[PDB]
Amino acid sequence: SKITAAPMVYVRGEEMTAYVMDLIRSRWIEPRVDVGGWETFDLRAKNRDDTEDRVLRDVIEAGKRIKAIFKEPTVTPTADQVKRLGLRKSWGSPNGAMRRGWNGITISRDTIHIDGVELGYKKPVLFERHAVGGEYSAGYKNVGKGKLTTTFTPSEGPDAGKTVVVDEREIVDEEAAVVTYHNPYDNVHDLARFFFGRCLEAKVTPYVVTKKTVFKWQEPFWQIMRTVFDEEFKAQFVAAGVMKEGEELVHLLSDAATMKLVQWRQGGFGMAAHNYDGDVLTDELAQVHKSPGFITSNLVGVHEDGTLIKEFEASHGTVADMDEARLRGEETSLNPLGMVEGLIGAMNHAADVHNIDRDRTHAFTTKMRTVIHQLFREGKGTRDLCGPSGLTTEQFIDAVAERL
Amino acid sequence: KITAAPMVYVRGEEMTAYVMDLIRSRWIEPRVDVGGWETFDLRAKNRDDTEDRVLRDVIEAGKRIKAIFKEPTVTPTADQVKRLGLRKSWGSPNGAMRRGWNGITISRDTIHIDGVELGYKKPVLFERHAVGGEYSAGYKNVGKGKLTTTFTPSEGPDAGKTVVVDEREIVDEEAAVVTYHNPYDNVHDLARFFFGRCLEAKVTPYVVTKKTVFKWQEPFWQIMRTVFDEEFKAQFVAAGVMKEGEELVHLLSDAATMKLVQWRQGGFGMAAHNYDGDVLTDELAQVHKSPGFITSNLVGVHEDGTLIKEFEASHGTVADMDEARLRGEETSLNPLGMVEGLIGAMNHAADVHNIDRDRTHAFTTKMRTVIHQLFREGKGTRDLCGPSGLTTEQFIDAVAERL
Numbered sequence: 001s002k003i004t005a006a007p008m009v010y011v012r013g014e015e016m017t018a019y020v021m022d023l024i025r026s027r028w029i030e031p032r033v034d035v036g037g038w039e040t041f042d043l044r045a046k047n048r049d050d051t052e053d054r055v056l057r058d059v060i061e062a063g064k065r066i067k068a069i070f071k072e073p074t075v076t077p078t079a080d081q082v083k084r085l086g087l088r089k090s091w092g093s094p095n096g097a098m099r100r101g102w103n104g105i106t107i108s109r110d111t112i113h114i115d116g117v118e119l120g121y122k123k124p125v126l127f128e129r130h131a132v133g134g135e136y137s138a139g140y141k142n143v144g145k146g147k148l149t150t151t152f153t154p155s156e157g158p159d160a161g162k163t164v165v166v167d168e169r170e171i172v173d174e175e176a177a178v179v180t181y182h183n184p185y186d187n188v189h190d191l192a193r194f195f196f197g198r199c200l201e202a203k204v205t206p207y208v209v210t211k212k213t214v215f216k217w218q219e220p221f222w223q224i225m226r227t228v229f230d231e232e233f234k235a236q237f238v239a240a241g242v243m244k245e246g247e248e249l250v251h252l253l254s255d256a257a258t259m260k261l262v263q264w265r266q267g268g269f270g271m272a273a274h275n276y277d278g279d280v281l282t283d284e285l286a287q288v289h290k291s292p293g294f295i296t297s298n299l300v301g302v303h304e305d306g307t308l309i310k311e312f313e314a315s316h317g318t319v320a321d322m323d324e325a326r327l328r329g330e331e332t333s334l335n336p337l338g339m340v341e342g343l344i345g346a347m348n349h350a351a352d353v354h355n356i357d358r359d360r361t362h363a364f365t366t367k368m369r370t371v372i373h374q375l376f377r378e379g380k381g382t383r384d385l386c387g388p389s390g391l392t393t394e395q396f397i398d399a400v401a402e403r404l
Numbered sequence: 405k406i407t408a409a410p411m412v413y414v415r416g417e418e419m420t421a422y423v424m425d426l427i428r429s430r431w432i433e434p435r436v437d438v439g440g441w442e443t444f445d446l447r448a449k450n451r452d453d454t455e456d457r458v459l460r461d462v463i464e465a466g467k468r469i470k471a472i473f474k475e476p477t478v479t480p481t482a483d484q485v486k487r488l489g490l491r492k493s494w495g496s497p498n499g500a501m502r503r504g505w506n507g508i509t510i511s512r513d514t515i516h517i518d519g520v521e522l523g524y525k526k527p528v529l530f531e532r533h534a535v536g537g538e539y540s541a542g543y544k545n546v547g548k549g550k551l552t553t554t555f556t557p558s559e560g561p562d563a564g565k566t567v568v569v570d571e572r573e574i575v576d577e578e579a580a581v582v583t584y585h586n587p588y589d590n591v592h593d594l595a596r597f598f599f600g601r602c603l604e605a606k607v608t609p610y611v612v613t614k615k616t617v618f619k620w621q622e623p624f625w626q627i628m629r630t631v632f633d634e635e636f637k638a639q640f641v642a643a644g645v646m647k648e649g650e651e652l653v654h655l656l657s658d659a660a661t662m663k664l665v666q667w668r669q670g671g672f673g674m675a676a677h678n679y680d681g682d683v684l685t686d687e688l689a690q691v692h693k694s695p696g697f698i699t700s701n702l703v704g705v706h707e708d709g710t711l712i713k714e715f716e717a718s719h720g721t722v723a724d725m726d727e728a729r730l731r732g733e734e735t736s737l738n739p740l741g742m743v744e745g746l747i748g749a750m751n752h753a754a755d756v757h758n759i760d761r762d763r764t765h766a767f768t769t770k771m772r773t774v775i776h777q778l779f780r781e782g783k784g785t786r787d788l789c790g791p792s793g794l795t796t797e798q799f800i801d802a803v804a805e806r807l
């Protein structure tokens with residue numbers, strides 16, 4: 001019989017990545033997997049306009065209920081795209097919505113490796129980007145001279161109801177930005193447990209990355225991680241030989257971590273950072289490794305029922321330049337490994353979170369990975385890694401499908 | 405013997421202070437009268453003992469003299485408070501200097517030696533906005549409650565009218581609440597400094613921000629682009645850097661981290677906000693070779709319009725080599741990054757005070773040429789020349805010999 005796919009949200013995009021995933025679903029998945037349990041959503045920039053971001057609020061609904069999501073790269077309907085695609089209106093990045101709609105704790109940005117192919121990092125690297133707070137949710141104004149005041153009124157504790165001044169300053173410039181933001185730190189307890197759990201499993205030395213020396217408000221991010229590590233993980237890490245006795249959890253300053261990403265070409269490490277630091281450091285990580293596509297973008301949130309909501313996406317966009325090449329009858333060679341790593345993760349999580357056909361699903365997803373890696377070893381991968389004698393997009397799809 | 409102009413000299417500790425003591429004893433003092441040098445003891449212990457009056461005195465001296473050389477220093481963090489037996493922890497001196505001297509820019513440029521291959525083939529220039537952002541934030545660590553940010557303009561048609569900038573319910577038992585500002589008036593000055601340096605160096609300039617998401621940053625780009633288009637674009641075309649119709653490029657901060665790893669040919673410049681510049685200049689140093697292979701020059705302005713310039717190396721005091729030294733063992737400290745700082749400071753001191761201009765400039769040029777030439781001959785330090793490289797004292801003597 002075919003493998004019974006567990007309930008999973010499948011978010012289709014457009015352009016080259018949608019063309020490639022249609023071939024992957026048709027030729028790799030569907031012959032071997034009953035995907036009846038998949039809930040499919042059309043996130044074409046058009047369909048987000050045409051439905052007024054209904055299809056987005058429906059994806060978020062399906063996500064909270066099913067807890068496993070594969071998302072293809074999508075076109076954010078920015079002002080440039082409204083004109084190009086003849087849309088009616090402009091719409092924001094879906095990330096903030098998904099990060100809050102699924103109680104996000106982290107975006108896992110991990111190095112993708114190919115057995116038999118050497119990339120920038122020799123061994124796996126793990127990165128945890130705090131999924132919430134910071135400047136991504138800042139309120140702000142561009143102003144000239146005047147007085148800026150920030151007050152806080154606690155709702156609890158011995159000073160409930162008492163308004164206190166957080167900051168007051170005189171702006172003395174004719175052109176200035178004034179900015180307020182918050183970092184919610186309650187879920188850093190869960191982030192710590194998730195991160196250290198993953199790092200132990202992977203046998204990588206974990207590091208915590210902040211600017212807490214100057215940005216002193218960041219101290220809790222560090223203190224919560226050290227506390228969870230010392231009480232719940234330091235023993236297991238010494239026992240597994242990842243860390244020696246007496247060795248302590250190391251904090252790295254954000255600016256220093258940019259230097260460690262370049263130095264530490266052996267890999268075998270893990271880092272956890274705030275939202276913005278993680279955005280910037282993970283792109284540096286991508287470039288040292290190979291390119292954006294060679295890092296995951298795996299959102300992990302916490303359901304009210306205590307299980308994890310996990311969304312998986314490739315770290316590249318829809319590759320419109322290649323879709324143009326295709327529609328000019330020029331050969332293409334899209335490496336689908338980034339998106340396949342995402343689909344594997346989604347299918348695996350769906351099987352685990354629902355307890356449906358776990359053994360067969362994990363065996364199939366592992367075989368897909370093993371088959372792809374072996375083609376790359378033989379010089380039968382895509383042209384990004386195998387050079388000009390590498391296979392086209394379609395030749396690669398067929399090469400994998402024959403070997404499943 | 406050269407009469408040194410008035411200059412502030414900020415002394416540190418550990419390996420770097422020992423190295424600079426020798427440089428002064430063997431290279432400077434036998435050829436230069438350093439009467440005009442005002443020296444300041446910025447040991448962590450001296451910051452702690454004077455309750456930072458020594459840092460207050462450095463800022464007052466810098467405003468008066470306008471030319472500052474600063475050795476690497478130990479910031480009195482909680483760990484250094486333990487290690488050095490201090491009474492209190494203290495912040496870095498940087499905020500005090502950058503704000504105290506009306507900072508505009510921190511210029512952080514790759515250090516190059518003809519005939520020595522480092523990470524970037526051609527010079528790279530970086531302009532970090534010296535002030536603003538989270539470096540001057542107010543903040544609290546709080547629980548649940550209501551956070552309100554108001555602004556009252558003092559000028560214009562809405563003067564006196566308090567407006568709401570932000571209002572949000574904090575729903576977490578543990579949260580940071582943060583308010584900061586970006587002062588953009590001196591970005592007009594940053595832009596002219598940056599594009600002029602890039603034009604001189606013939607490098608392609610880029611502006612780096614997160615303005616697509618952090619939209620309050622839009623003016624940083626608009627000010628720079630307006631200055632570029634009005635004052636510099638045609639010059640960039642005529643210098644062979646850019647083609648007609650090519651526009652100034654904006655890079656997102658996260659994309660710029662990728663470009664620093666990719667663009668190993670160098671020949672580019674980047675301008676960024678304070679924090680973006682902090683992280684990118686550390687990345688820049690590492691791709692080039694190491695922390696000290698980047699200059700660090702703060703440019704500010706006195707209320708009388710005279711530029712205040714401070715110069716330092718981009719490395720620390722290298723405690724580990726001081727330890728190895730005190731154990732009688734061999735060291736190899738490359739002093740080029742520190743000497744580039746001293747050269748800039750003495751050159752500015754000479755230019756601002758008009759004291760022995762011609763001879764100071766010749767001595768500073770010779771110091772650099774003598775150092776660079778020794779590296780070309782495999783008689784540099786072991787960081788560039790390998791084990792066959794000279795020791796700290798051997799390198800100091802070798803340079804002394806050739807002046």
Ligand SMILES: [Mg+2]
Nearest residue numbers: 255682683686
């Ligand atoms: Mg720094």
